[PDB]
Design an enzyme around this catalytic site. Structure first.
Site, short mmCIF file in Angstrom:
data_model
loop_
_atom_site.label_atom_id
_atom_site.label_comp_id
_atom_site.label_asym_id
_atom_site.label_seq_id
_atom_site.Cartn_x
_atom_site.Cartn_y
_atom_site.Cartn_z
N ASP A 62 69.64 65.90 88.17
CA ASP A 62 68.78 66.87 88.80
C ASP A 62 68.90 68.18 88.64
O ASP A 62 68.58 67.78 86.69
CB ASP A 62 70.02 66.80 90.11
CG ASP A 62 69.58 67.51 91.38
OD1 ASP A 62 68.16 66.90 91.48
OD2 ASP A 62 70.01 67.33 92.13
N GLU A 64 63.28 62.91 100.44
CA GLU A 64 64.51 62.61 99.37
C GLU A 64 63.79 61.54 98.20
O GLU A 64 63.40 62.01 96.92
CB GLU A 64 65.42 62.02 99.60
CG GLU A 64 66.07 63.15 98.33
CD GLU A 64 66.30 63.79 97.94
OE1 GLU A 64 66.30 65.00 98.76
OE2 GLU A 64 66.70 64.48 96.53
#
Ligand SMILES: Cc1ccccc1CC(C)(C)NC[C@H](O)c1ccc(O)c2c1OCC(=O)N2
Length: 457
Positions: A223, A214
């Site tokens: 994001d 990640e």
């Protein structure tokens, strides 16, 4: 009586022979082996050298002076002999302090460990220890900064055949603190956190894995969905205002971050995100039967998919989860490669698929290096954690603690400590120099090196 001399003759020689053979085997093993030349073993070499010179120059003359009851090698050579004894104990205990700090430093921050501790920084630590050890044993003795307390003590220094140990209040406390009490509290507090850091040794492997898959970001990053996250996929708030992202970050962290956080702070947020995710796997009726059949390494690979797609996405693999519950690894690896998740992150899905296949930490080279040093030092569970960490601290304790306590208490009141007990407790400290080869050399590569030098199988 002849028996008691023989008893001392065979017992003291046993300690000399056991200390020498143990250290010689450890030194020659790292020398004639390539895989045993790790940077962690660069420090244990100084431990064996500080212990081999002990069993070759300190322990032999320690028994020869006791049997004959009189020194017969000159007074200057005894000042030299006393210097070696303290120089080795200082270099031995301070190295034991370095061993504990080194193995703890790699567990907490594994990524930095391979970046800072190089061949230069490894020798500097060993050079600094022997310099600190040399400046606290040799120089105070070669300058006569320890003696001249009483009139009786003076006589044994002038005599070339008498040599006992008489030190003033200053050198008795100063040397004991530099040799024992400073490395004691450090090793006590380091292993106190090592035992605490290993209480979640399963989450640490997931943390270093998700840092490669990640990605950890110390600063706030927006994001793809348009929301603000922090650390490793940890949502701050769904509001598009960056001011709300800072206030939400201040509550979970506990300080004024202004966006930027540290490694351990993001690692503590990772522990809350995992515990909130493992409970979700047990909450979902389709993920719980799969979680009950997966091993420890593959359980982390399943949580790896939860951090990327969520419990809704992980449940979307009916064929894979069906074969995972039935323990069909290679078949589950093919259906996972046919999904859309494999097509968007093939480099990550492969490492997750490879983890589901073999059940090892392959494709994660740093994490696999962690399992070796974690199990070597801590173990698996509560029964193995207190056991290994207990005998490493117990051996160092039962040998040197009774001596230095008696050594310090002697300075409080004269004639309160018997001389024969003082020698025995110092001698018990020597035995620790023979136990270290059979304590810190439990590495798998050490087991291969020890069984090959002795022609075992
Ligand atoms: C020479 C003789 C005569 C009778 C009995 C024993 C001995 C051998 C001696 C006492 C030199 N052993 C040194 C001992 O291992 C030692 C090690 C590290 C230290 O920091 C200290 C220390 O001594 C007390 C101290 O304050 N500092």
């Amino acid at each position: 009586d002849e028996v008691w001399v023989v008893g001392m003759g065979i017992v003291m020689s046993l300690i000399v022979l056991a200390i020498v053979f143990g250290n010689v085997l450890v030194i020659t093993a790292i020398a004639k082996f390539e895989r045993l030349q790790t940077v962690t073993n660069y420090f244990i070499t100084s431990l064996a050298c500080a212990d081999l010179v002990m069993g070759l120059a300190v322990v032999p003359f320690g028994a020869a002076h006791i049997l004959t009851k009189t020194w017969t090698f000159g007074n200057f050579w005894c000042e030299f002999w006393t210097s070696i004894d303290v120089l080795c104990v200082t270099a031995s205990i301070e190295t034991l302090c370095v061993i504990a700090v080194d193995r703890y430093f790699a567990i907490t921050s594994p990524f930095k460990y391979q970046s800072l501790l190089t061949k230069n920084k490894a020798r500097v630590i060993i050079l600094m220890v022997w310099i600190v050890s040399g400046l606290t044993s040799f120089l105070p003795i070669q300058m006569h900064w320890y003696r001249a307390t009483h009139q009786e003590a003076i006589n044994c220094y002038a005599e070339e055949t008498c040599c006992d140990f008489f030190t003033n209040q200053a050198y008795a406390i100063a040397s004991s603190i530099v040799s024992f009490y400073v490395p004691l509290v450090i090793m006590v507090f380091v292993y106190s956190r090592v035992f605490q850091e290993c209480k979640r040794q399963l989450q640490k492997n997931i943390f270093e894995m998700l840092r490669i898959d990640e990605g950890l970001r110390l600063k706030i990053y927006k994001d793809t969905e348009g929301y603000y996250t922090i650390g490793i996929g940890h949502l701050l708030t769904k509001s598009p205002s960056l001011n709300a992202a800072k206030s939400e970050l201040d509550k979970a962290i506990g300080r004024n971050t202004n966006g930027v956080i540290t490694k351990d702070e993001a690692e503590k947020l990772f522990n809350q995100d995992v515990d909130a995710a493992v409970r979700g796997i047990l909450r979902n009726a389709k993920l719980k039967p799969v979680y009950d059949s997966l091993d420890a390494v593959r359980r982390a690979a399943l949580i790896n998919m939860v951090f990327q797609m969520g419990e809704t996405g992980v449940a979307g693999f009916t064929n894979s989860l069906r074969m995972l519950q039935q323990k069909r690894w290679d078949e589950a690896a093919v259906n996972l490669a046919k999904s859309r998740w494999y097509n968007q992150t093939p480099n990550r899905a492969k490492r997750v698929i490879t983890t589901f296949r073999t059940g090892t930490w392959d494709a994660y080279d740093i994490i696999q290096r962690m399992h070796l040093r974690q199990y070597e030092l801590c173990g698996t569970g509560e029964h193995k954690a207190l056991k290994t960490l207990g005998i490493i601290m117990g051996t160092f304790t039962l040998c040197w603690l009774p001596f230095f306590i008696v050594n310090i208490v002697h300075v409080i009141q004269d004639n309160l400590i018997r001389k024969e007990v003082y020698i025995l407790l110092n001698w018990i400290g020597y035995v620790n120099s023979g136990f270290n080869p059979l304590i810190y050399c439990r590495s798998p590569d050490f087991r291969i090196a020890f069984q090959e030098l002795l022609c075992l199988r």
